[PDB]
Amino acid sequence: RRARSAAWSYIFLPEEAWCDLTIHLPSAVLLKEIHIQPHLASLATCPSSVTVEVSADGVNMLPLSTPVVTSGLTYIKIQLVKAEVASAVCLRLHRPRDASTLGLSQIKLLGLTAF
Amino acid sequence: RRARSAAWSYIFLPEEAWCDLTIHLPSAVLLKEIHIQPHLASLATCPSSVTVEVSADGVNMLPLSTPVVTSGLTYIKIQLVKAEVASAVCLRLHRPRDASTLGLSQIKLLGLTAF
Numbered sequence: 001r002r003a004r005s006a007a008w009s010y011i012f013l014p015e016e017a018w019c020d021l022t023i024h025l026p027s028a029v030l031l032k033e034i035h036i037q038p039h040l041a042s043l044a045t046c047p048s049s050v051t052v053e054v055s056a057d058g059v060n061m062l063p064l065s066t067p068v069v070t071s072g073l074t075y076i077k078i079q080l081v082k083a084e085v086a087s088a089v090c091l092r093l094h095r096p097r098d099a100s101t102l103g104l105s106q107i108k109l110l111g112l113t114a115f
Numbered sequence: 116r117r118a119r120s121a122a123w124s125y126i127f128l129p130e131e132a133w134c135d136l137t138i139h140l141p142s143a144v145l146l147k148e149i150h151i152q153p154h155l156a157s158l159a160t161c162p163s164s165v166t167v168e169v170s171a172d173g174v175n176m177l178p179l180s181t182p183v184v185t186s187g188l189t190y191i192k193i194q195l196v197k198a199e200v201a202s203a204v205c206l207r208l209h210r211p212r213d214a215s216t217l218g219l220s221q222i223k224l225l226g227l228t229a230f
Binding site for chain 2: 042
């Protein structure tokens with residue numbers, strides 16, 4: 001807490017409105033919750049809206065729902081009502097409403113494997 | 116900048132969702148823009164939505180429009196299309212979306228007097 005430096009910072013072009021982060025798990029697991037941690041020192045760099053793309057095959061992303069508004073949140077916790085298999089998870093992050101830089105502290109993919 | 120302490124901090128009760136700040140000008144002036152500065156060190160304490168109540172008589176508040184969403188903004192600038200007389204300005208500030216404390220740095224009422 002109060003690290004004052006973003007772990008990952010993205011610079012937005014003026015034409016660009018969505019930044020993609022794609023996580024390829026080594027094997028397909030059941031996915032229940034996804035936790036995204038914005039930068040606590042500056043919530044101006046927090047994304048305005050985050051939609052979540054998952055893929056059971058890992059190459060064809062069939063996402064989950066509408067984009068969730070994440071403005072003014074110290075911690076983004078996205079929880080699935082239905083747990084679904086996902087060998088790859090892609091995250092489209094919108095441009096922040098005021099700042100032009102995207103600040104993320106940590107991305108967590110919580111779930112269970114079989115066997 | 117980076118003062119790390121809010122100039123004014125409000126503690127929210129769990130039942131309370133709106134906090135009112137009422138500014139009584141000594142004389143009625145034309146009002147064009149209202150500038151509200153949230154706490155720059157922590158935008159978790161920034162209000163989620165701010166509606167603006169003005170009053171020409173100063174005792175009967177006839178507000179201006181729907182509440183403006185202010186989540187994730189380093190600076191709240193509210194500008195009137197039509198300048199209206201206002202001897203008193205009241206500001207209802209919503210509870211922040213994540214934090215339970217309201218952090219404001221400065222409130223500015225920009226306008227013109229006659230004569």
